[PDB]
Design a protein around this motif. Sequence first.
Motif, PDB file in Angstrom:
ATOM      1  N   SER B   6      -3.993   1.146  19.743  1.00  0.00           N
ATOM      2  CA  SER B   6      -3.219   1.113  21.021  1.00  0.00           C
ATOM      3  C   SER B   6      -1.683   1.232  20.905  1.00  0.00           C
ATOM      4  CB  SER B   6      -3.603  -0.144  21.759  1.00  0.00           C
ATOM      5  OG  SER B   6      -4.885  -0.029  22.369  1.00  0.00           O
ATOM      6  N   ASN B   7      -1.184   0.392  19.962  1.00  0.00           N
ATOM      7  CA  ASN B   7       0.131   0.116  19.352  1.00  0.00           C
ATOM      8  C   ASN B   7       0.065   0.367  17.825  1.00  0.00           C
ATOM      9  OD1 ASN B   7      -1.128  -2.040  18.151  1.00  0.00           O
ATOM     10  ND2 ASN B   7       0.519  -3.480  18.585  1.00  0.00           N
ATOM     11  N   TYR B   8      -0.288   1.594  17.431  1.00  0.00           N
ATOM     12  CA  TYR B   8      -0.008   2.142  16.069  1.00  0.00           C
ATOM     13  C   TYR B   8       1.539   2.174  16.023  1.00  0.00           C
ATOM     14  CZ  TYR B   8      -1.342   5.074  11.861  1.00  0.00           C
ATOM     15  OH  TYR B   8      -1.513   5.604  10.614  1.00  0.00           O
ATOM     16  N   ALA B   9       2.217   2.371  17.182  1.00  0.00           N
ATOM     17  CA  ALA B   9       3.683   2.293  17.369  1.00  0.00           C
ATOM     18  C   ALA B   9       4.307   0.917  17.047  1.00  0.00           C
ATOM     19  CB  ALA B   9       4.065   2.731  18.771  1.00  0.00           C
ATOM     20  N   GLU B  10       3.662  -0.233  17.151  1.00  0.00           N
ATOM     21  CA  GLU B  10       4.356  -1.512  16.860  1.00  0.00           C
ATOM     22  C   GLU B  10       4.802  -1.462  15.388  1.00  0.00           C
ATOM     23  OE1 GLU B  10       2.110  -5.213  17.582  1.00  0.00           O
ATOM     24  OE2 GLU B  10       3.713  -6.220  16.578  1.00  0.00           O
ATOM     25  N   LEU B  11       4.008  -0.814  14.548  1.00  0.00           N
ATOM     26  CA  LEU B  11       4.311  -0.655  13.107  1.00  0.00           C
ATOM     27  C   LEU B  11       5.746  -0.143  12.896  1.00  0.00           C
ATOM     28  CD1 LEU B  11       1.188   0.746  11.261  1.00  0.00           C
ATOM     29  CD2 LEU B  11       2.171  -1.565  11.351  1.00  0.00           C
ATOM     30  N   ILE B 101       4.301 -10.612   8.939  1.00  0.00           N
ATOM     31  CA  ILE B 101       3.610 -10.227   7.726  1.00  0.00           C
ATOM     32  C   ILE B 101       2.161  -9.986   8.071  1.00  0.00           C
ATOM     33  CG2 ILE B 101       3.054 -10.721   5.319  1.00  0.00           C
ATOM     34  CD1 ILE B 101       5.454 -12.617   5.302  1.00  0.00           C
ATOM     35  N   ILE B 102       1.621  -8.813   7.683  1.00  0.00           N
ATOM     36  CA  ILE B 102       0.272  -8.268   7.993  1.00  0.00           C
ATOM     37  C   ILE B 102      -0.590  -8.294   6.727  1.00  0.00           C
ATOM     38  CG2 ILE B 102      -1.085  -6.389   8.870  1.00  0.00           C
ATOM     39  CD1 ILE B 102       1.751  -5.132   9.636  1.00  0.00           C
ATOM     40  N   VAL B 103      -1.546  -9.194   6.652  1.00  0.00           N
ATOM     41  CA  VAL B 103      -2.412  -9.267   5.464  1.00  0.00           C
ATOM     42  C   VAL B 103      -3.573  -8.304   5.664  1.00  0.00           C
ATOM     43  CG1 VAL B 103      -1.606 -11.552   4.905  1.00  0.00           C
ATOM     44  CG2 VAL B 103      -3.584 -11.271   6.405  1.00  0.00           C
ATOM     45  N   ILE B 124       2.115 -14.496  10.986  1.00  0.00           N
ATOM     46  CA  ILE B 124       1.139 -14.016  10.020  1.00  0.00           C
ATOM     47  C   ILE B 124      -0.079 -13.492  10.775  1.00  0.00           C
ATOM     48  CG2 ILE B 124      -0.181 -14.622   7.908  1.00  0.00           C
ATOM     49  CD1 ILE B 124       2.723 -14.921   7.430  1.00  0.00           C
ATOM     50  N   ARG B 125      -0.468 -12.251  10.634  1.00  0.00           N
ATOM     51  CA  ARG B 125      -1.692 -11.781  11.311  1.00  0.00           C
ATOM     52  C   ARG B 125      -2.406 -10.888  10.312  1.00  0.00           C
ATOM     53  NH1 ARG B 125      -1.567  -6.538  14.591  1.00  0.00           N
ATOM     54  NH2 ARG B 125      -3.361  -6.619  13.153  1.00  0.00           N
ATOM     55  N   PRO B 126      -3.898 -10.612  10.265  1.00  0.00           N
ATOM     56  CA  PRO B 126      -4.614  -9.694   9.455  1.00  0.00           C
ATOM     57  C   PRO B 126      -4.982  -8.413  10.146  1.00  0.00           C
ATOM     58  CG  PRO B 126      -6.248 -10.937  10.552  1.00  0.00           C
ATOM     59  CD  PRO B 126      -4.872 -11.361  11.048  1.00  0.00           C
ATOM     60  N   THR B 127      -5.369  -7.403   9.410  1.00  0.00           N
ATOM     61  CA  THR B 127      -5.882  -6.185  10.032  1.00  0.00           C
ATOM     62  C   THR B 127      -7.370  -6.381  10.326  1.00  0.00           C
ATOM     63  OG1 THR B 127      -6.295  -3.857   9.741  1.00  0.00           O
ATOM     64  CG2 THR B 127      -6.663  -5.274   7.842  1.00  0.00           C
ATOM     65  N   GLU B 128      -7.891  -5.636  11.294  1.00  0.00           N
ATOM     66  CA  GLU B 128      -9.349  -5.370  11.433  1.00  0.00           C
ATOM     67  C   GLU B 128      -9.368  -3.854  11.642  1.00  0.00           C
ATOM     68  OE1 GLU B 128     -12.528  -8.021  13.284  1.00  0.00           O
ATOM     69  OE2 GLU B 128     -10.797  -9.299  13.730  1.00  0.00           O
ATOM     70  N   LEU B 129      -8.678  -3.121  10.732  1.00  0.00           N
ATOM     71  CA  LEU B 129      -8.770  -1.563  10.814  1.00  0.00           C
ATOM     72  C   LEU B 129      -9.302  -1.198   9.423  1.00  0.00           C
ATOM     73  CD1 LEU B 129      -6.599   1.424  10.931  1.00  0.00           C
ATOM     74  CD2 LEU B 129      -8.617   0.843  12.262  1.00  0.00           C
ATOM     75  N   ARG B 130      -9.079  -0.026   8.778  1.00  0.00           N
ATOM     76  CA  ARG B 130      -9.477  -0.100   7.341  1.00  0.00           C
ATOM     77  C   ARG B 130      -8.297   0.495   6.560  1.00  0.00           C
ATOM     78  NH1 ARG B 130     -11.921   1.585  12.292  1.00  0.00           N
ATOM     79  NH2 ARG B 130     -13.082   3.559  12.088  1.00  0.00           N
TER      80      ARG B 130
HETATM   81  O1  LIG Z   1      -4.470  -1.844  14.069  1.00  0.00           O
HETATM   82  C1  LIG Z   1      -4.244  -2.209  12.940  1.00  0.00           C
HETATM   83  O2  LIG Z   1      -4.915  -2.962  12.279  1.00  0.00           O
HETATM   84  C2  LIG Z   1      -2.955  -1.601  12.332  1.00  0.00           C
HETATM   85  C3  LIG Z   1      -1.836  -2.438  12.822  1.00  0.00           C
HETATM   86  C4  LIG Z   1      -1.476  -3.571  12.117  1.00  0.00           C
HETATM   87  C5  LIG Z   1      -0.383  -4.346  12.518  1.00  0.00           C
HETATM   88  C6  LIG Z   1       0.329  -3.958  13.635  1.00  0.00           C
HETATM   89 CL1  LIG Z   1       1.772  -4.836  14.031  1.00  0.00          CL
HETATM   90  C7  LIG Z   1      -0.007  -2.868  14.385  1.00  0.00           C
HETATM   91  C8  LIG Z   1      -1.087  -2.103  13.975  1.00  0.00           C
HETATM   92  C9  LIG Z   1      -2.801  -0.090  12.528  1.00  0.00           C
HETATM   93  C10 LIG Z   1      -2.586   0.097  11.016  1.00  0.00           C
HETATM   94  C11 LIG Z   1      -3.080  -1.334  10.809  1.00  0.00           C
END
Ligand SMILES: O=C(O)C1(c2ccc(Cl)cc2)CCC1
Lengths: 300, 237
Positions: B6-11, B101-103, B124-130
């Motif tokens: 949705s927010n690939y842009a927040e990155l 920080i994205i684990v 601190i948040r994790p991904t659920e993408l791959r």
């Molecule tokens: O959706 C995700 O998992 C991804 C992601 C992780 C952190 C933020 Cl801030 C925004 C998007 C997209 C690449 C990992």
Amino acid sequence: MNTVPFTSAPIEVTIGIDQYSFNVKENQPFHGIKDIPIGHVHVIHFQHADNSSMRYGYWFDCRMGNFYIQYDPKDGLYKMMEERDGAKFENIVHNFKERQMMVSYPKIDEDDTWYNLTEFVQMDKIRKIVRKDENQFSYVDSSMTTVQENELSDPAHSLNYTVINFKSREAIRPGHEMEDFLDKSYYLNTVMLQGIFKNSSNYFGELQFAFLNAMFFGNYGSSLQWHAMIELICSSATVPKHMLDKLDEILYYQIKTLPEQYSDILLNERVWNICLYSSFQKNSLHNTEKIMENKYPELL
Amino acid sequence: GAMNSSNYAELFNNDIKLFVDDTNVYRVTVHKTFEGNVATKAINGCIFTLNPKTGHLFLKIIHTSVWAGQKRLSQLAKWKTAEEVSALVRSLPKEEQPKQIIVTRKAMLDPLEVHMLDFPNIAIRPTELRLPFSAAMSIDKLSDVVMKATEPQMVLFNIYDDWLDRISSYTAFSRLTLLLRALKTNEESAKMILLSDPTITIKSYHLWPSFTDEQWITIESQMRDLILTEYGRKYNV
Ligand SMILES: O=C(O)C1(c2ccc(Cl)cc2)CCC1
């Protein structure tokens, strides 16, 4: 034995006295409860027949004064009050007994349940969790939130339990992150036992008081507190043997007394499975584990 | 604590963020003992800590000596990762400390939260993408510095080489994840794609070849072809 007289019962209400309860009909000639065992705290609690919203009630100790209940038609609830005129109060109680308009606190002489649930609970401590210092008794109800709940809105009506949080600086010594998070013995024994509670009796008393407010009033914050305090002990690799043995006894009777119909909302599956099956003290709660398995194997 | 695409842009916005990958921190070879049992031998690992906007890579080398006489190493690895990451944050000037920080693995949320208690405003948040970050060891220069290390060592890289002079971070990170995904799916063929033409070299201060824009398009296409194939090979399609 002591007595809690009622001026009247103008509205239909289910009255609780410790783990006992009886129905009173709109303007039934009810004038109170007698033969209350001295030496224990007690709780008298109320659920109006017309509005099950707001279970509410009063923690008191008859040794600390002469207490009666009076319905208040403006505020719409049964209110505990203290009678300072001692001659007047004996007078009122004797007449109501003579006219036998009082139910008898129905203790079975073989039954230690109430003692077993209130062993470590002391009015002086209750009055510090429930701050209203002009009264010798303490009001609690379903909706009262805890200090920790307000941190995450009126502090005058809060339940001031000891804040426990496993991911806090208080719980986690700098440099001992992994150690103190996986084995909370530091947090239990130095921070809480030695630092805050001073001894295990005060810890167990808050533990029991939290359980009781959860069960009698469905106070969610109290339930959260009860579970936290169990988990801290169970997640501590190093606990005094005497604490483990008492804790098993405390919890057994709490499980024993819990209404089965309430088991789905008052027991946290995660905490109990962790405590009984994964924690350092998994093998140290034999009585408690045997009744959990025989009565509520579904949760596990 | 994982969101959607949705927010690939927040990155790629202006809030400083880092990706922490612990896959290659604790690394072993498994082997048979003279008595016919199985034993592990640890080899050097690394923490892969990346700013997706800048391409800066804080490659914390984990020397095998850190495990000596330790129990429960796979669990310890997560805490060692969280300790190193926290040390990195504390070593950065305030204005360079991340806001979040994205684990890449959910098992790191609690080790890191606990180590970062001093930094409550760092989310601190994790991904659920791959994400393919485990393939960072397939990058030759990165693999080489890890394996040669004789002591703990922090080595700083720009994983985008000079791309940002020519493309946006969004594109730069899409190219990197496509290169890493390819390397993870079929390393040999991925590395063949990248070097087949010896006239295109890797500068001494770069990790990847000096492709023109035109040549990057062709390369990216060949990596997509590769991944699509291996998907066929694998699933028979
Ligand atoms: O959706 C995700 O998992 C991804 C992601 C992780 C952190 C933020 Cl801030 C925004 C998007 C997209 C690449 C990992």
